[PDB]
Amino acid sequence: EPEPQMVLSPLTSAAIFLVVTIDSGGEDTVRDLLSDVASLERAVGFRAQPDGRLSCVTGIGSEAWDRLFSGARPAGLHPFRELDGPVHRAVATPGDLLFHIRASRLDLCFALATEIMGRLRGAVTPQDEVHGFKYFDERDMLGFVDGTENPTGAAARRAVLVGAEDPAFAGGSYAVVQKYLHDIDAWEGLSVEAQERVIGRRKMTDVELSDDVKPADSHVALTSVTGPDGSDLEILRDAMPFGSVGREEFGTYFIGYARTPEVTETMLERMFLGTASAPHDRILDFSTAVTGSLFFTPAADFLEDL
Amino acid sequence: EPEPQMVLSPLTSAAIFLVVTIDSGGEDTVRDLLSDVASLERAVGFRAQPDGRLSCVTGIGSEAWDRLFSGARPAGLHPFRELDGPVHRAVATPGDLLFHIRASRLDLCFALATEIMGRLRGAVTPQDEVHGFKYFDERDMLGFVDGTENPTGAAARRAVLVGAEDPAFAGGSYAVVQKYLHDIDAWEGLSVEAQERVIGRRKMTDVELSDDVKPADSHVALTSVTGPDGSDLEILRDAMPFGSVGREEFGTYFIGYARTPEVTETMLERMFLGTASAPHDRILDFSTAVTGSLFFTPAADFLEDL
Amino acid sequence: PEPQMVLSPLTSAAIFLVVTIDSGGEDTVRDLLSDVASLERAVGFRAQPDGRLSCVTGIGSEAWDRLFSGARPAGLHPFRELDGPVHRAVATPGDLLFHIRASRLDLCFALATEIMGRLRGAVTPQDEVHGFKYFDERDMLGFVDGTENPTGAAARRAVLVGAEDPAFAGGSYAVVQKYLHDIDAWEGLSVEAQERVIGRRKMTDVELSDDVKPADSHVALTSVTGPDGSDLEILRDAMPFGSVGREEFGTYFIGYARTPEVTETMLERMFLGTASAPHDRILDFSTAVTGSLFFTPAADFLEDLS
Amino acid sequence: PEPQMVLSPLTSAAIFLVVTIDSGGEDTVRDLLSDVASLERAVGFRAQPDGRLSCVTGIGSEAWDRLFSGARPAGLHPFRELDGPVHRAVATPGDLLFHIRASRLDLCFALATEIMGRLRGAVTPQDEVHGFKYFDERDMLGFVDGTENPTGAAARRAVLVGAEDPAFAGGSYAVVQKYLHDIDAWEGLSVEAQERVIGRRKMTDVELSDDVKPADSHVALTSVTGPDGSDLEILRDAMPFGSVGREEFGTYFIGYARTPEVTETMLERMFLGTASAPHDRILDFSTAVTGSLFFTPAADFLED
Amino acid sequence: EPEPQMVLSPLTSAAIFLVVTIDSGGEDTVRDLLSDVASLERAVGFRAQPDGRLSCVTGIGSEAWDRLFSGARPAGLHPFRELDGPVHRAVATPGDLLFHIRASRLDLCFALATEIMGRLRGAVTPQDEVHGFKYFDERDMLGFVDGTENPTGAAARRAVLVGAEDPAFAGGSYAVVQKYLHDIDAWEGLSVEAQERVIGRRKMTDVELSDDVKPADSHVALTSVTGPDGSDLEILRDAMPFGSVGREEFGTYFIGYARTPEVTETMLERMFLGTASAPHDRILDFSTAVTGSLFFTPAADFLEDL
Amino acid sequence: PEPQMVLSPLTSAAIFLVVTIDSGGEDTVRDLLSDVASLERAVGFRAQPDGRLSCVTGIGSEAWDRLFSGARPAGLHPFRELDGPVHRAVATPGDLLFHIRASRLDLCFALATEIMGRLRGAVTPQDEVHGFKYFDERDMLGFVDGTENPTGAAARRAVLVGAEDPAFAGGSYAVVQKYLHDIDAWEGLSVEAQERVIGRRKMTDVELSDDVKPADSHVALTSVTGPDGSDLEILRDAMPFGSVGREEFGTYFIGYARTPEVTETMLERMFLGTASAPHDRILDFSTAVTGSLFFTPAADFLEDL
Ligand code: HEM
Ligand code: HEM
Ligand code: HEM
Ligand code: HEM
Ligand code: HEM
Predict the structure, then answer these.
(1) What is the number of the ligand closest to the CA of E281?
(2) What three-state secondary structure class fits D149?
(3) Which residues contact C13 (CB under 8 A, 6 or more apart)?
(4) Rounded to an integer, what distance in angstroms lies between the CA atom of residue A39 and that of residue A35?
(5) Are strands D123-132 and D13-21 parallel, antiparallel or unpaired?
(6) Is residue C142 within 8 Å of C240, Cβ to Cβ?
(7) Does residue A200 contact residue A220 with C-beta atoms inside 8 Å?
(8) N or C: lower Cβ tally within 10 Å for chain C?
């Protein structure tokens, strides 16, 4: 088989997201680093096992792929598609490489990011760097549990990993990232019952609203999608709180993994453009997107044979 | 009889340092928050006990003290003293209020900082915000164990807490903060043996160099000071690594607590001005101070009384 | 096919709930069964990774006939009462079993509260037991309990239905019995006499040699080989329970097997005896007061209902 | 003098046992009392450091007179029944209290088994409750419970008898009530309405400001100031309990104080009300079915 | 007030006991090491906190004291006295220095022992080296819980630390060590009931036998001693199992601390010489002493000043 | 076929036992082998989940012929002595290996006591070592030890016998060597000089680039490719041991492989050298004083006795 990267990681309380662009003539340095990234992960992580749980998932953008490699391309790889809805806009921002670094402690993430960027100095320019921390009861910046309905085990593998539909790229995945800033003053102006009608789940107990109370423009109603054959279309999320108390910056760094970008893109279209039944996802009246990029995360053996 | 704030904290792997100035007319809002800060600490921290270990130490600058309170001044409270050495400078920067927030996780520090700054918006301006993380083996940004010779138990109480010498302020302490950025490039150019001659201890095993081979301009030699009676003068440190790999910012946020500022200021004078035997502390040839402030951290009952 | 969480990691707390379905309660019950996996996620996700909450849901032979209109699992029948010369294994009513396990009683109790909230008016409670395991895996008799359970691949082969009943693959069969002990009589035996009842050493949990182990010891009678001389295995998670006021000291027995015939062969040898043994000596200090049999279907069977 | 483990670390499991002493049981009881600290060590030591097992032993007003001759602790009396306009605090029988706490129910149950084994034939059980805390210190009403308890030095001064009753120094007074909740009615309230009953925000556990806090909120009525304007404090370790089958959802209340006067002033305000408040709004969703008062002596009193 | 060595330690699962003699002319090397040993403890231990729990207690024999120091002798310090009972003998064996090294892991003990013996090679001759391990439920080599009736908190300090009776040595303690080998074959030939009559406690539940059943020659009866007034004389023990399965060596390395040696030596006289009511301690019919030594463990400041 | 616990989680304590079978001891040994998995559960289950106790049982080449009739595992032979120009890999006697691992020394000790209790009078001890790993996975030379071990499916492929020897599938081959270090000489090197001996950075455990890594560094010599250009890998769990009184500072080496040919190729390059290197520089600070080879069968092979 092909061996996947660590897309299906165990639960982690800390994360670093790094997005860079490749400077002109930086290609060779980048290909050198990509062949060594799993070795750097083992070197930083092994001495802190079994509790460290350090991993790095490496992603490549559509334009970067054409600069790095000749030949066949993953079937779904394109630049993030901007959405200009009647009220809300999903922006596309630059990004050639993604490092999704996760662990039980921020210091491990930071040590592996230091070795990665040390190897890339002179070849890349930083676009975004976020240090994520999860709240102790899995809560996000809106005060709701975040992760509950992710798929697990076999269902997760089927949802996230490329298989026989794109055989040359089997064991790969597609990652969409969006950094959101929240308007917390507006959000805290709602009662708890009004907040629940935005999300579609109870705040304190995390039980889903009944089919008879759940609004058509609630976040959970719009991100719930069935395919033609009536199967659930699922993604795997590992969204993380971040920000700065001084600048009054309260955010959610969103990442979703899927076997095809079509599933993630159908969810984003319903959220930003709406449906017959809903103008837009009510979560967006308290959340502004400031970045948007799409990456292909290849099989581990693809990176190792560079 | 008077109950100290949590100056003598158990070991914590995360910290937030917040330094603010009080805007004109902000005094009353500030006094109201100071009387509630212990209540806010319990509200965020109690539900995560016993492993959260959340604490907040609140400090007040010399000029802020005169705007907030009439009556007696703590005996040792003055503005941080700038040090103009022939090569190295210890700069003085503005700060009226210090919040030293510590816990076993960054998310708890961040939740308490959010409640504090929520009460003060409109009354203060942020000067510095740092999110610190400790390495898994108590290492700092230079790769040395950091904290080894701090005093513990009764020796720590004697070294840090004001007593009979200033009876109205007993159970208080004095906090000096400096943010340092390191030249990691220059530091990693040294052999391990050359790094040991800068610090004064072995890197991997943290054994002190013997009295005959320890250089006179090593960090350990210069911060070792005896009083007139031949007593060792000690401080309590809780320095934290911080940074951003994208902006190449690798730092140490220094905080030191002492029963009198004269002990910390004797250490800073030896480091920046030198002695007959040493021009300056060699650690300063790889470390630049960008902030400097001095605060009195009163007994908890002093803050509760307002 | 995705099993329910039959093969769970070690748990120190459990709630057993046995209920009968009132006339006309069927539709409410079918609605709850389609939601029970989502209720497990709602209560459990925010307490991960340490909570380790799971629920295994079972259906009795007569309830199956009232709920579902197609094929029956091949081994599902009402518990068979065993009328021995001395000891009786009684059959008591039960339509639905909830086997709820976690690292803490409060999590089991929160999931039981949500389940029973959905069933109020549709079911009548028959049994509710709150179990606790001793810190060194000991039971109410003071012996280590679980030692010879199968693990890994052997456990899956022993417990999960496969090719022999393909429509119900990934299911299992659960036998429950509540036992009350005569602890006064038990504690009147010497430790050596207790060892001859169980078949293992009390302090060190070493199996008695084939030369000393009596024919009517618990371990001799629950050791059974199939036609090829292969060991027939069950998976147990028996839990102590009781009340010191009422002098109630119990063991709540649950055993899981791929076919009821394995557990029923073990009960026949215990209660009816063999050529070599009148009955299991453990029964001279243990009285069964309940007995029921349940089919625990594959998770996808419960999810795909109406 | 060495106190019993009144000031315990946080515990997630508890057994409450209340018994009466049968006639002629006195000597069996006095034998167990001299050995109960030994039994605590016997069951607990092998499960350190995580077990955190302790047992606090209390004696009622009537029982004291049957067991001991000489001076009585100054504040020891039978629980006082409160007959309010709407809500009633009942007085129920109890001679001995065992407050058993640990990180796991199985350790509580092991110590309870050895204690009741020693007392079989001398005592009648009145109450047995097995308590569990929710993983974020929440109680049966879904609020954080314990937040304003005193800690360290403040806790010692609030809870332990000192120079005012020198023969009984290092003792405390324990008040217990078992409450059953109407959870149906409680879950019918909005979160905002629940906050106005308790006097704290539900999700973040921040006290309501003095301008929005209702006068008949639980926190407003259990706030009492002394002559010098000091806070009068108690130490609580109230525990959820119940049965899902029988629809029984409860809080087993225990409060410790250096004098019963502090706890009894709080109960009078809750049940009788004041000029400003009819009664504590928490009592429109909580019914007391037991009430008892115990003196918890110093460890050395029990030993000698 | 004087700072004790870490005599009152938290529970530790591993230990190294080192006993050495000072070679002729080794005195100055030894005095140099003694002034550094607390700094070596911090150097090895700090980076492994909070779980390491590493400490070292340093003791000095009666004859060594006279070679190392001029001035006052601690009032209770004398050579261990041999006990020649009718059946059992307590031997006295040489030792000038004791290192009692404890931690949560053997590797920490070993790293500190390596640094100590590195400083002394050429100055000392090793007499005994023992690597101790406690069983997971505090059980010893005889299978009984060991430590239960040790004093804690304030009672422990009163029992172990020298006070105003010998003011120059306040915060010191007296350590007696004996290495015992067990006859395991003979011991395991006893029933649990017979083992309980030797120890004086129930094996599984660690409940003390009643005054009416506890034999007069049981270990617990003979090591229970009351002073001239009425009160219990206590010592603090941290005895550890040790052995070699190859050599058939199964041992208990006994260490007891007391404020005066008279308490420990009264316990030894009752065990070896017996009373009116008992010939000897029944534990001695399964345990042979092969070493016996007495040390004074001074206050930490005594060692630091020299 | 259910393997023994070769692929164990990380363990901080170990006991290694090597014994020879006395005349007439065969029957006692066969009895103990059929019971050893049940003794592991008896000592370990009560201490789960933190105990992580396991025992791996191995049998030497000569012992196999005394214990069992029928087929021999294809790769089982006596350890081959290497007499290199400077350094020697010695062979020492061994019929049975017990590789006992846990999170605490006391659990290893309890299981070794029950095993040796069953064998008293049937076996003679050759070697007994009590191992301890440093808290940050460091070894006796002060380097992280384990970093490049294979994990998951790559580990199973590297260690477990498959279709090449079908009657012995789920078995493995263990090579043991006890090493004593000259720590005085080692600690006389600068950190930079030590890195050039190992082939990795000491503090950060980053591999030296192919351009700086010397040809006689330990990592260069124990890196081996097959005909197919694929890496040949082993699974190691080498453990520090010593006695501070005796000045004994050691590494007890154990390596597991699907075939002995992989471990034997690594030992030949270390002790005999290559075109580019006289010998492994790690051997100028490490002396081998034991050497033995064992087959560790599938668990069901031992049970069906
Ligand atoms: C870049 C900033 C700094 C770094 C990375 C740093 C790092 C260290 C390190 C590695 C040690 C040795 C281990 C220990 O005992 O903790 C140490 C010791 C110490 N440092 Fe610093 N230090 C810094 C700044 C300061 C400053 C500004 C002061 C005083 C104002 C200071 C006072 C001390 C003292 C008192 C010790 C203990 C000396 C002894 O062994 O007795 N440090 N520092
Ligand atoms: C009072 C109720 C029971 C108690 C207290 C109890 C206790 C025990 C104990 C202490 C063991 C030995 C350790 C171990 O788990 O391996 C054991 C083993 C066993 N018990 Fe029971 N048991 C009970 C009832 C039952 C019942 C009703 C069954 C089956 C229908 C059962 C089946 C087994 C089996 C299969 C084993 C393992 C046998 C082997 O070594 O292969 N037990 N039980
Ligand atoms: C159904 C029974 C009870 C429930 C569920 C309950 C629940 C709570 C809650 C959630 C708090 C707020 C957070 C905290 O400080 O813990 C609280 C505070 C408190 N309760 Fe209660 N309580 C009950 C009965 C009682 C009784 C009977 C008393 C006194 C006799 C009492 C005295 C207090 C005190 C003193 C406070 C703290 C007030 C302050 O902030 O100073 N409670 N209780
Ligand atoms: C191989 C040697 C020894 C073994 C295996 C051993 C074992 C134990 C055990 C199992 C207990 C009961 C549980 C407890 O409270 O710790 C105990 C108690 C005790 N042991 Fe020993 N012991 C040994 C030698 C000694 C020596 C040589 C002395 C005194 C010089 C001693 C003094 C004590 C004392 C003072 C107690 C506490 C008794 C009480 O007050 O209840 N032991 N020992
Ligand atoms: C004498 C004591 C020994 C010590 C102290 C030692 C130490 C080390 C250390 C520190 C590493 C680096 C980290 C790692 O990947 O584990 C390593 C790697 C390794 N050692 Fe050794 N080793 C020893 C003997 C041996 C022996 C006898 C063999 C083989 C027969 C061997 C084969 C290996 C292999 C295969 C690797 C991984 C190579 C790679 O990176 O691909 N070692 N050893």
Answers:
(1) 4
(2) coil
(3) C101, C102, C103, C104, C105, C107, C108, C130, C131, C132, C133, D105
(4) 9
(5) antiparallel
(6) no
(7) yes
(8) C
Q: How many residues does chain C have?
A: 306
- In the three-class reduction of DSSP (H, G, I as helix; E, B as strand; rest coil), residue D62 is classed as helix
Interface residues from chain D to B (CB-CB < 8 Å):
9-10, 136-138, 144, 146-148, 152-154, 204-207
- Residue D267 CA: which ligand is closest? 3
For E55, list phi and psi in degrees, rounded to 5.
Answer: -145, 160
CA F267 to chain centre: 13
Atom of ligand 4 nearest to the CA of E150: 15
Residue of E nearest to D113 (CA): E205
| Cβ atoms A140, A146 nearer than 8 A | yes
β-pair type (F88-89, D13-21): unpaired
E299 Cβ closer than 6 Å to some ligand 4 atom: no
- For ligand 3, atom 4, name the residue with the nearest CA: D251
* Maximum alpha-carbon separation in chain F: 58
Rounded CA-CA distance D242/D178 in Å is 11
C-alpha to C-alpha distance for D287 and A6, rounded to whole angstroms: 54
Q: F249 to chain B nearest CA, in Å?
A: 17
Nearest ligand 1 atom to alpha carbon B140: 5
Q: Which amino acid is at E61?
A: G
Kindly state the tokens that stand for D163: 């120079």
The rounded distance, in Å, linking the Cα atoms of B301 and D223 is: 19
Is residue F257 helix, strand or coil? strand
- For chain A, give the residues followed by a break (C–N over 2.5 Å): none
CB atoms within 10 A of CB B210: 9
Please provide the distance, in angstroms rounded to a whole number, between the alpha carbons at the two ends of chain E.
18
Structure tokens at F293: 């080879």
3-class secondary structure per residue, chain C: CCCCCCCCCCCCEEEEEEEEECCCCHHHHHHHHHHHHHHHHHHHHHHCCCCCCEEEEEECHHHHHHHCCCCCCCCCCCCCCEECCCCEECCCCCCEEEEEEECCHHHHHHHHHHHHHHHCCCEEEEEEEEEECCCCCECCCCCECCCCCCCHHHHHHHHCCCCCCHHHCCCEEEEEEEEEECHHHHHCCCHHHHHHHHCECCCCCCECCCCCCCCCCHHHHCCCECCCCCECCCEECCEEEEECCCCEEEEEEEEEECCHHHHHHHHHHHHHCCCCCCCCHHHHCEEECCCEEEEECCHHHHHCCC
**Does residue F148 have its Cβ closer than 6 Å to ligand 5?**
yes
To 10 degrees, what angle do helices A106-120 and A27-45 make?
Answer: 150
The answer to whether the bond into E50 is cis (omega within 30° of 0) is yes
| Residue D199, amino acid | G
E146 is catalytic: yes
Q: D-chain residues within 8 Å CB-CB of A192?
A: 190-192, 202-203
Whether C294 and C6 have beta carbons less than 8 Å apart is answered as no
Q: Is the CB of E253 under 6 A from ligand 4?
A: no
Nearest to C259 by CA among C73, C82, C95: C73
> Phi/psi at D233 (nearest 5 deg)?
-120, 150
Alpha-carbon span D246 to D261, nearest angstrom: 36
Cα of A299 vs its chain's centroid, Å: 17
Residue A121's SS3 state is coil
DSSP structural state of residue D205: -
Three-class secondary structure of residue D294 per DSSP: strand
Structure tokens at C221: 């009678």
Residue A173 pairs in a beta bridge with: A297
Chains with 3+ CB–CB pairs under 8 A to D are A, B, C, E
User: E210: which residues sit within 8 A by CB, 6+ positions away?
Assistant: none
> Residues in chain F whose beta carbon is closer than 8 A to a beta carbon of chain B?
136, 142, 190-192, 202-203
CB F7 within 8 A of CB F296: no
Pair of tokens at residue E91: 């031997």
